[PDB]
Symmetry: D2
Subunit: 297 residues, 4 copies
Amino acid sequence: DKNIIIGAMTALITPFKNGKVDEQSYARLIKRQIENGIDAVVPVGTTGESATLTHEEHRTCIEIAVETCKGTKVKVLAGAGSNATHEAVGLAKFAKEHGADGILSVAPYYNKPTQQGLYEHYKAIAQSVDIPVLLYNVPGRTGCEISTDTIIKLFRDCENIYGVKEASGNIDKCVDLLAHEPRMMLISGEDAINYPILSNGGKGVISVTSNLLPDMISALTHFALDENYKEAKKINDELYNINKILFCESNPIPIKTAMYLAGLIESLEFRLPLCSPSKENFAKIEEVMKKYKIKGF
Amino acid sequence: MDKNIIIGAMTALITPFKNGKVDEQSYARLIKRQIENGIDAVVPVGTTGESATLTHEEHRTCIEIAVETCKGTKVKVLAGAGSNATHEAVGLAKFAKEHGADGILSVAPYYNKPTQQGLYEHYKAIAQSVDIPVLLYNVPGRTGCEISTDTIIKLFRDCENIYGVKEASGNIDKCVDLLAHEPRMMLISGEDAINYPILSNGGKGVISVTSNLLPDMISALTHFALDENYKEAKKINDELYNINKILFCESNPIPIKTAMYLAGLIESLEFRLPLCSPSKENFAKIEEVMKKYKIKGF
Amino acid sequence: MDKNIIIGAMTALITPFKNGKVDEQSYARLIKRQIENGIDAVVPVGTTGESATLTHEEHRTCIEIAVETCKGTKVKVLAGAGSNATHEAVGLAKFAKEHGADGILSVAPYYNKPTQQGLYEHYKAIAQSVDIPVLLYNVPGRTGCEISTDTIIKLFRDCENIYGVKEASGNIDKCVDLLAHEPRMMLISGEDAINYPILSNGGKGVISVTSNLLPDMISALTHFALDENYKEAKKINDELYNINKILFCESNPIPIKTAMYLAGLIESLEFRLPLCSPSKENFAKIEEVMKKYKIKGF
Amino acid sequence: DKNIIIGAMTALITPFKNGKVDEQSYARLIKRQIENGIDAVVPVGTTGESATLTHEEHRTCIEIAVETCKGTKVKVLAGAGSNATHEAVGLAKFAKEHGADGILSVAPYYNKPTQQGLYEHYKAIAQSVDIPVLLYNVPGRTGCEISTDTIIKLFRDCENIYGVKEASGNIDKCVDLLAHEPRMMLISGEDAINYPILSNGGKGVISVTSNLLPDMISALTHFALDENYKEAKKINDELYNINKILFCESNPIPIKTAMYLAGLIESLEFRLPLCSPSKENFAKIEEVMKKYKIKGF
């Protein structure tokens, strides 16, 4: 096989305090993920508000995850994608330099490359580092889809591309992927359907919910990897309400709202154009939260 | 909620024509082939059976043939009986019950887009008119409407004989929603490519297009799943993916009838308009996918 | 001379029910009101007239009443006569001609998803069965299929009496596509909110829901545009925008029937299942928007 | 009341040569636009591959547009937008300093802000400069929609927001917009439907096709603005084939290909993730081009 990063993973939120990244809170939150069975953390993905961080903050966030995971079996899969290939290569190289175990690389958003463009984009990225690269498909945000054929070609042509995070609400595609190329690591990027993706041979999750409920997401994932499907589904069913409410408005608006209500971050603060949820949605999130046992620090 | 149910591996039967006429001999023969290959129920005159272009008497006849042919076996008959007019859907359900069907499959009203309130009243009226099991059938790509999860669960709870839903909506999230909130219902896969994922989440059957051609493979998949042998179920589901997709290269049942003709299982590649033969190109694509599969004869 | 066509401002008639039956006296009176308010043609038994839930006998009664009421006036009857079964659509087409219809509106097959080749043969069968004008009707959100621009153009060119299409697809790109490649056809708006843009691009009429309530406004709009008085046609389209949207807050004809009842134009708010009354919330929403419009009486 | 930029406008392609911006070609292309009746030019929009340009190349393009338009009545509506409000604000001021007459600012892509966030996003942009701001809605690329209510509110609350470029294939929305706020400048961002948008009160276009056929786009627009709808439609009808083929692959892949095929640029290069179209699409574009009279220099 190739070198891989799988298991229960968390797309880390990035707490702000008075506009500034709260780096002490960020380290604390990672330790909390670590203590609750999480296998890897994903600094500066979509959930971490990658769009609104400076390059230096981006790098710092990776550094913090790296430093915090040292001395543990937990890995850092650093968010490093861009819709400009030169920037994506740069971010990938930095991530490798700061000691990341691998990178998560979102499909170019907004500029809608063709399948050929996506292929050359990821081929260029994979060639720039000797560390694992997980592709990330999320057409609702990007405006483009990495097709199954392109994913499979990338996996077969590039040594370090080992799988894809799918956030596309398409279980047919998930079947297509693993039926034609069962060696790849399919990763769930959609919490509500973690179980179905794992039960089809998916080997991990990159989760939003796990920011709030890491013990539950890790237990779910580990049961499925142990083929204890009954237990995995049970947790998946249990988590459905919170998994959905965490998307009542665009992620990470609801998850930051939950983390704040839980006393886990200090300030319900975003960077524009993101902002507080509506009062209605704030109330729904707080209400759904009452059904769950939330781990403290 | 106890209810009486029809679950397991089920086939949405194609309806063969010979010179425009329903070939009833061929129909009975096809059903026997399903039976001998381990199928649990058959669905006469659903979408796959060209329900839209059969007369009412042909519709009744097909249900009748299914019931009679399945006599002397464990195989159940889940009769297609839906309509976008509530009075007709009720009439159809009543017919199905009188002809001895074990249950009915009742598609959401197509074309006229009833609201969720209307869907609830529609199905409640159907459900109240007969005491046999009713399976809801959601297929928004064909009907132009969606029975919401909330509407489905309400119907399941409020009407004793409504026991589940056939979903053909490519929506595994909804499948989770359904069974997480109401784990007593029978979720049935109406989409062959994703049979295994639905069953592994607690689905209890399939109503299959592919099983017309490969009943033994669809039956084995389903039964492996029900026995919690997920490895084997997934293995068959992965193997079938290619045939599962190509059977929808044009609108169902155009490809499956083409495959049945190519396999020598039906005599004539005939439809009733507005359905018609596939393109020569799709004809050849179907033929070449079939070659990767071992197709049971009579 | 002139090619035989039915165009201008046209109304998709609601079918009023009294105690479960077609209110015929109401029906005739409603058509009379359309006639007196500048309408060029009426459409009995379309989507808006709940065609799906009417019996064949009721379909007849509505068409006859329409024919009798327009008789001696310039106003034409473009009768609904489509089906997802070609043998039925042919029968319905002949049925409509024989009852005195000037032409037919024939919806694309719903639910069974014919291919473009199927649609072609479907409509060719229909067109050859009668000698009166045939208007195609594309509404993919309801039928689950699309008559492609290519298929519409080939049907228009190959069949004499197919003279155009009613588009209800929210797709102005297609409307440009149609009239750029085949400018001889009659593109008819089946979407009230965008009546003007369709007409400003060369469309030759509308088949309107809103005209049930405000026939004088819709006909004036259509005739301004037909006269290349685009400023005035737009002005009316703009002020009708609110009522045009609210009449679709729930599936048509649920809102338009609510509005007609509210206006005192029909005497019973009755639908046939699966259609039913709107929510209290939408009822009040409809009642409010109406307050901004001058509604003609009888 | 409200300074505006309307009329026939071109979303400029950015020619690359040996990986670099071809500054001489850029200038020559703009002159050609000017000489063919165009009312404004949009440097570094989507069609100009904004995503993959550096800040310095961005500056260079605007400066070249401004310098080349000097002494003409032709205006420079600069691409200046981002999915991070702080950057978007910075780009807006940066465009003003470099002499842009106005800015085109696209809805935040990828991070999917809420309508409340969109409102705050644009209000911050509008209040940071004193030149006209045109909103740009293109949900297929951004993954979000600026609602009619949000557009009208921004138009009414912020002095310099004067209109919106719509690329949403939604004439219903165009009706809604101009029915409720007929004072705004609705600008077509979808070449195929230029005429229907203009005939409903639209006051201009920001065109892709005008790169290749500027004389035709300008006449269409000016005919329409003068209420000669017959002539405006006639041209829109004739352009339909080319308007569609120029989107056979994602803009600007086809238009830059067409310009090269036409002999109007000397190299055909994109920045990854963009690339040349398929061989068969090269052929398709070429066949469609043969039906039009393409102005030289």
